[PDB]
Amino acid sequence: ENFQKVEKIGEGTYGVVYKARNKLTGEVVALKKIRLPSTAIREISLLKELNHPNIVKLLDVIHTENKLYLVCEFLHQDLKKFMDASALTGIPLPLIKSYLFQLLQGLAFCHSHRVLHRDLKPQNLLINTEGAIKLADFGLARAFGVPVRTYTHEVVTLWYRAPEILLGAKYYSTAVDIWSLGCIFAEMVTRRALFPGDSEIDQLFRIFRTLGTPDEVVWPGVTSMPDYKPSFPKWARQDFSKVVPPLDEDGRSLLSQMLHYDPNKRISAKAALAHPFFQDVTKPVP
Numbered sequence: 001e002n003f004q005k006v007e008k009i010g011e012g013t014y015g016v017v018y019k020a021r022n023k024l025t026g027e028v029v030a031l032k033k034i035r036l037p038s039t040a041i042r043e044i045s046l047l048k049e050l051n052h053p054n055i056v057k058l059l060d061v062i063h064t065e066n067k068l069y070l071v072c073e074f075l076h077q078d079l080k081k082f083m084d085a086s087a088l089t090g091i092p093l094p095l096i097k098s099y100l101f102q103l104l105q106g107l108a109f110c111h112s113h114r115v116l117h118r119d120l121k122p123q124n125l126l127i128n129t130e131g132a133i134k135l136a137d138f139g140l141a142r143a144f145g146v147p148v149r150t151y152t153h154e155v156v157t158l159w160y161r162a163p164e165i166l167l168g169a170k171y172y173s174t175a176v177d178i179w180s181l182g183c184i185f186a187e188m189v190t191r192r193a194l195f196p197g198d199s200e201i202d203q204l205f206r207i208f209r210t211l212g213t214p215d216e217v218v219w220p221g222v223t224s225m226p227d228y229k230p231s232f233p234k235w236a237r238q239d240f241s242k243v244v245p246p247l248d249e250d251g252r253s254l255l256s257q258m259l260h261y262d263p264n265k266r267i268s269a270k271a272a273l274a275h276p277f278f279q280d281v282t283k284p285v286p
């Protein structure tokens with residue numbers, strides 16, 4: 001009886017989200033319920049301290065009756081819905097730039113605390129009516145693993161997955177989130193997913209057909225990754241001018257750096273924020 005359900009507002013990889021009202025404070029919140037060694041409660045509890053204007057505020061973590069509840073600030077819409085609703089005309093470039101600038105600040109903060117997301121996608125980027133955008137679900141992928149199917153048996157999207165993950169690397173760096181964010185960036189600009197794979201191999205070959213099949217020159221160590229096969233077809237790289245029109249030259253330079261194959265060479269969030277693409281960044285209200 002601590003929270004009143006108002007309405008169901010969404011479904012993530014692990015559980016359902018309701019808008020709720022805090023009985024005793026009157027505050028409106030988003031309450032995620034997840035069913036069911038395990039360091040998940042410790043690690044997720046630590047995210048209550050990892051506060052930033054571009055990270056969804058984690059108000060509380062409740063473990064009771066073999067369910068995990070996450071109490072978050074209420075935000076009104078995800079980026080996937082906003083992109084679908086903006087399909088006819090597209091999100092305006094100054095708003096795209098504002099959103100990427102803010103998302104990079106959120107990543108830079110978590111990354112500075114050694115915390116990775118590992119599963120960024122438009123569905124977990126939430127916006128308000130004031131012009132802010134925030135990252136949701138930090139910590140959940142690491143705590144629980146990324147399953148093939150969600151709790152409601154939907155396919156977990158591969159579209160934003162970094163190539164080192166797809167090639168079976170055992171160690172993920174903060175670069176995995178930069179890759180994902182660069183995919184989201186291209187999708188806002190073109191109104192179409194950059195790499196819409198429908199299996200792990202289809203995802204990898206879509207990446208290869210655009211960026212070129214990687215070799216030891218662009219990506220040292222690539223031919224010794226666990227899931228690398230010498231039989232991969234060898235596609236030549238496309239020019240970014242084709243990939244994301246009509247992004248200007250600064251956006252294209254930034255995007256190419258977010259999409260470097262080698263996780264060691266891929267631009268950091270901190271470095272991306274200093275990119276000349278942001279020289280004229282503003283905060284428009286949609």
Ligand SMILES: *CCC(=O)N1CCN(CC)c2ccccc21
Nearest residue numbers: 010017030032070071072075136
């Ligand atoms: C704690 C609530 C939560 O995890 N999130 C991320 C998932 N969703 C549903 C899209 C959400 C919406 C509004 C506010 C927070 C959250």
